[PDB]
Amino acid sequence: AGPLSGLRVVELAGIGPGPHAAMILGDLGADVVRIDRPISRDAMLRNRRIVTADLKSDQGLELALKLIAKADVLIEGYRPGVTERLGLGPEECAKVNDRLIYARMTGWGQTGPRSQQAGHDINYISLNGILHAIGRGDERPVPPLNLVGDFGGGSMFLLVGILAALWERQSSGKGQVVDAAMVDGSSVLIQMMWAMRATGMWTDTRGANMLDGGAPYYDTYECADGRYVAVGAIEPQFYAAMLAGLGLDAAELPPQNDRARWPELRALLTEAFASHDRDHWGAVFANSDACVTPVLAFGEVHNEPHIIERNTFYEANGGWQPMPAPRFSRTASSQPRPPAATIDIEAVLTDWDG
Amino acid sequence: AGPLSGLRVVELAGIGPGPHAAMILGDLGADVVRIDRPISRDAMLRNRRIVTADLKSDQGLELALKLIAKADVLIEGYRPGVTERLGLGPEECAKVNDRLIYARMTGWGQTGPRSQQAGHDINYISLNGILHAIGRGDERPVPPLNLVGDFGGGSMFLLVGILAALWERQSSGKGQVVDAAMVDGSSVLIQMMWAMRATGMWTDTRGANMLDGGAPYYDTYECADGRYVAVGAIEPQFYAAMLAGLGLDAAELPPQNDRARWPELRALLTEAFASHDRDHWGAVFANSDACVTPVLAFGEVHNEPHIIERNTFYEANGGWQPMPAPRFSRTASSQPRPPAATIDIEAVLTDWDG
Ligand SMILES: CC(C)Cc1ccc([C@@H](C)C(=O)SCCNC(=O)CCNC(=O)[C@H](O)C(C)(C)COP(=O)(O)OP(=O)(O)OC[C@H]2O[C@@H]([n+]3c[nH]c4c(N)ncnc43)[C@H](O)[C@@H]2OP(=O)(O)O)cc1
Ligand SMILES: CC(C)Cc1ccc([C@H](C)C(=O)SCCNC(=O)CCNC(=O)[C@H](O)C(C)(C)COP(=O)(O)OP(=O)(O)OC[C@H]2O[C@@H]([n+]3c[nH]c4c(N)ncnc43)[C@H](O)[C@@H]2OP(=O)(O)O)cc1
């Protein structure tokens, strides 16, 4: 029901970014067909049809090619060379479908000294300065889950590449190959820090900057009950609203941006936030511009009113799952269809007319 | 001359996710005109034309609308209602140009108890379970910069929304409004953890999961020189390669996935990595499938061979900046044009024939 209704996608079963990108297309209305080796409980595989094929066999290669012959997009996330040796590489695909957006999702890229090397998110972000910048200054870097490599700088860039190439195709009449490497996407994801580095506004010191937990006004605080609030009161007026709620006299504190006294500032705020429960502060700052919010664990998210009101999550069999994003005023997406039984590839071919 | 060459984008100057989305469009060849309030050293403002106008005045509003009538996309990132009051709301823009993709970038969304409330990245990810999940278990949550709210679940979702709507526009001949809320995008960004929580494969316990630093084989380790390597050896055979490079006898270690013995495994690995310098580990692995990589600080990145060969970065003046991502085989993106002097708004309108 979304904006991508009409769009046909072949997804070669992979892990991490590939399936995430395929899920978002499906979310937004795309007809995604995932080819697996010969009924799912991975919510990630919502909004598909699943077929099965041995791509190492003559019959399996031939069917996949018939399916690809009728697709708009192909998603693959294997090592470079893998689809080639299978006979499903870009050059082989062009012979059956020159309108195909051949989307290749990797960590290191299609080429380069590391392109044949195994890796995971933490590796791609360690090589480009990102991982080094995450965590407290007094200890080793901490991975920001696999949000930055696999998803933010991964599947999200594959998607931009895919949708950008479809725009191109409206005038060229032709597809092309999208080489989405997590080491690249994630660097453009963090371009703000690269920009700020050049103007003296970000340093290579972990835990000592405006947005990394270094600023007492941009960090979490432990409250009386061991639970946490997030403070993000960057602007002076929001910061002022923040002090007031805490019952602190501004004239008694160090200036917000005297970094020399940041330890003193943080200590006073720590004492303030520790004096009451997280839910107390959420009540104090409920409607304010203080940029103070309760840090909710996954299990609690479903009870937060702004989360509820906006239907950010739906209940899908044994748990909450995020509704599609972003939102569209005219061609709104449907609630995702759950993973179902595998179906006959020929039936998919029949549907598509292949 | 990237794939979005031809696309016309009016960007109403803002902070964080909006400019980043506009940057990525321009990176990929879009004609982006940024209207600012009346030459930059924010490399983030690369690939633009900058014009200036007073949107509150009769005249400034008039020109902005003339610009908008000739555009494909409008990006705005203010509080809901702001453009409405200016006379640049979706309904007003529709009257001049019903093909316009009106892209509204916010943290809380257009509607809901928090839609009028101030906030920043940290606040949006505090409300949807994300920030709670980030950092060591024994400490308060750490913010993963503004990578997940502003960018990964922010600009990136705005971008996917923009390009999805353009796809739909081919059929309907019409545009629509994209409501891109960081609270929504970041939740879809983290869909994997929502999926896993439902099958017992992820817990709300910070720092005690497979991908959050909890697993000894998926975390950083400090080396003899006080620098760090990242270990990402999820699969048995990568883990096995990792142990072989360390000179550890697997028969003498606890099993990779015996969680009960993780502290013991981590102590053994800690002791090993601490015995030589990062660049020694750098060299011992460097080539293998051990998923061990050096943790490079921003300042070191430009010296890494894989970074160099693939031209992930370019030198702007005074520093390295990320080249466009992802990459396109046929319509390759140009090296970004640096920020230039403000252009005359009438001159852009002349260009666009507006
Ligand atoms: C120093 C920083 C740059 C570095 C930095 C970078 C990144 C970050 C991260 C952490 C962030 O999250 S930043 C993003 C913050 N949040 C969002 O974008 C969510 C949606 N936005 C908002 O809620 C708000 O815009 C907010 C960011 C909180 C700021 O609130 P605000 O009251 O200052 O602004 P507002 O959007 O409510 O209203 C805008 C105001 O300006 C006016 N305006 C705009 N353009 C023009 C123009 N060309 N000519 C004349 N007037 C103009 C509008 O009329 C409007 O006024 P009005 O009286 O109608 O409210 C933090 C800091
Ligand atoms: C939590 C769980 C649920 C999800 C999850 C999400 C994310 C993550 C982490 C954090 C990640 O980062 S995942 C993404 C990691 N990196 C990448 O994707 C980058 C690109 N990929 C790669 O380099 C590799 O595929 C890598 C992931 C490192 C694994 O290496 P590998 O040797 O196992 O894989 P490979 O690509 O070299 O080989 C593919 C192999 O599969 C075969 N294949 C495919 N389809 C079929 C079929 N239908 N029938 C028969 N055979 C088939 C191919 O022929 C090929 O074999 P080959 O002869 O080429 O070795 C982990 C798990």
The enclosing domain of A330 has a CATH number of 3.40.50.10540
Domain check: are B71 and B172 in the same one? yes
- Which residues in B97-116 are b (16+ Cβ under 10 Å) and which e? beebbbbbbbbbbbebbbbe
Residue A178 carries which side chain, given as an amino acid letter?
Answer: V
> A277 near A271, Cβ under 8 Å?
no
- B31-36 and B49-52 strand pairing: parallel
Domain check: are A189 and A275 in the same one? no
Last residue in a domain, options A296, A314, A341: A296
3-class SS of residue B108: coil
Query: What is the CB neighbour count within 10 angstroms for residue A354?
Result: 17
CA A171 to chain centre: 30
3-class SS of residue A309: helix
- A101-106 and A176-181 strand pairing: parallel
Number of domains within chain A: 2
Contacts of B163 in chain A (CB under 8 A): 159-160, 163-164, 166-167
Alpha-carbon torsion, ordered B281, B285, B286, B287, to 10 deg: 170
- Is the C-beta atom of A11 inside 6 A of ligand 2? no
Please state how this structure was obtained.
X-ray
Pick the closest to residue B331 from A255, A138, A177 (CA basis): A177
Pick the closest to residue B214 from B158, B149, B138 (CA basis): B138
Continuous H helices in B75-212: 82-86, 90-96, 121-126, 156-172, 182-189, 191-197
Q: State how far the Cα of B303 lies from the Cα of A33, in Å rounded to an integer.
A: 42
Domain check: are B30 and B10 in the same one? yes
Domain check: are A114 and A240 in the same one? no
Pick the closest to residue B17 from B184, B190, B193 (CA basis): B184
CA B77 to chain centre: 16
Last residue in a domain, options B279, B296, B313: B296
Domain check: are B234 and B170 in the same one? no
Under DSSP, the state recorded for A72 is: S
Tracing tokens 């800690």 back to the chain, one arrives at B270
Domain check: are B162 and B271 in the same one? no
Per the omega criterion (within 30 degrees of 0), is the bond before B326 cis?
yes
Residues in chain A: 354
Q: Is B183 on the interface with A (CB under 8 A)?
A: yes
Q: State how far the Cα of A17 lies from the Cα of A148, in Å rounded to an integer.
A: 11
Q: Give kind and range of the element (H or E) at residue A156.
A: helix A156-172
- Which residues in B293-304 are b (16+ Cβ under 10 Å) and which e? bbbbbbebbeeb
- B8-12 and B73-76 strand pairing: parallel
CA A173 to chain centre: 30
Q: For A73, left (φ over 0), alpha (ψ -120 to 50), or beta?
A: beta
Query: What is the CB neighbour count within 10 angstroms for residue A334?
Result: 14
- B218-222 and B228-232 strand pairing: antiparallel
> B278 near A160, Cβ under 8 Å?
no
- Which residues in A257-296 are b (16+ Cβ under 10 Å) and which e? eeeebbeebbebbeebbeebbbebbbebbbebbbbbbbbb
Tracing tokens 């007003």 back to the chain, one arrives at B92
Q: State how far the Cα of B146 lies from the Cα of B156, in Å rounded to an integer.
A: 13
Per the omega criterion (within 30 degrees of 0), is the bond before A326 cis?
yes
> A169 near B159, Cβ under 8 Å?
no
Q: State how far the Cα of B276 lies from the Cα of A340, in Å rounded to an integer.
A: 51
Domain check: are A186 and A320 in the same one? yes
Sheet of B292-294, strand order: B218-222, B228-232, B292-294
Q: List beta partners, residue A75.
A: A11, A103
Domain check: are A156 and A257 in the same one? no
Under DSSP, the state recorded for B128 is: S
User: With 0-12 CB in 10 A as exposed, 13-18 as middle and 19+ as buried, what is A148?
Assistant: buried
Residue-number span of the structural domain to which A271 is assigned:
208-296
Domain check: are A265 and A250 in the same one? yes
Q: State how far the Cα of B273 lies from the Cα of B293, in Å rounded to an integer.
A: 12
User: CA angle, B53 as apex, B49 and B59 as ends, to 5°?
Assistant: 130
Whether residue A191 and residue B117 make contact (CB cut-off 8 A), yes or no, is: no
Kindly list the protein residues whose Cβ atom lies closer than 6 A to any atom of ligand 1: A 211, 234; B 15-16, 37, 53-56, 77-79, 82, 85-86, 106-107, 118-121, 146, 150
Domain check: are A258 and A343 in the same one? no
> B44 near A192, Cβ under 8 Å?
yes
Query: What is the CB neighbour count within 10 angstroms for residue A128?
Result: 28
Contacts of A322 in chain B (CB under 8 A): 184, 187-188, 190-191, 194
Whether residue B322 and residue A187 make contact (CB cut-off 8 A), yes or no, is: yes
CA distances from A165 to A80, A103, A123 (A): 20, 10, 28
Q: State how far the Cα of B267 lies from the Cα of B297, in Å rounded to an integer.
A: 25
Domain check: are B150 and B171 in the same one? yes
Q: Is A350 on the interface with B (CB under 8 A)?
A: no
The enclosing domain of B282 has a CATH number of 3.30.1540.10
Output the CA A106–ligand 2 centroid distance in Å: 10
Query: What is the CB neighbour count within 10 angstroms for residue A170?
Result: 12
- B101-106 and B327-328 strand pairing: unpaired
Backbone CA torsion sign across A283, A289, A295, A298: positive
Q: Is B338 on the interface with A (CB under 8 A)?
A: no
Q: State how far the Cα of B116 lies from the Cα of A37, in Å rounded to an integer.
A: 49
Q: What are the backbone dihedrals phi and psi of residue A69, each rounded to the nearest 5 degrees, phi first?
A: -50, -25
If one residue of B11, B42, B78 were mutated to test the ligand 1 pocket, choosing by the most ligand atoms within 8 A of its CB, it would be B78
The DSSP secondary structure of A98-125, one letter per residue, reads TT-EEEEEESS-SSSTTTTS---HHHHH
Tracing tokens 């108890």 back to the chain, one arrives at B113
Give every CB contact of residue A283 below 8 A, 6+ residues apart in sequence.
Answer: none
Longest dimension (CA), chain B: 78
The DSSP secondary structure of B10-72, one letter per residue, reads EEE--STHHHHHHHHHHHTT-EEEEEE------GGG-S-EEEE--TTSHHHHHHHHHHHTT-S
Q: State how far the Cα of A191 lies from the Cα of A184, in Å rounded to an integer.
A: 11
Last residue in a domain, options B261, B278, B296: B296
Domain check: are B304 and B222 in the same one? no
Q: List beta partners, residue A8.
A: A31
Q: Which two tokens stand for residue A213?
A: 């937990």
Q: Which two tokens stand for residue B246?
A: 């360390």
Backbone CA torsion sign across A73, A150, A293, B86: negative
Residue B33 carries which side chain, given as an amino acid letter?
Answer: V
Pick the closest to residue B125 from B145, B139, B140 (CA basis): B145
Tracing tokens 């919010």 back to the chain, one arrives at A293
Q: State how far the Cα of A22 lies from the Cα of A332, in Å rounded to an integer.
A: 18
> A323 near A2, Cβ under 8 Å?
no
3-class SS of residue A25: helix
Q: State how far the Cα of B256 lies from the Cα of B259, in Å rounded to an integer.
A: 8
B176 vs A153, A312, A329: nearest CB: A329
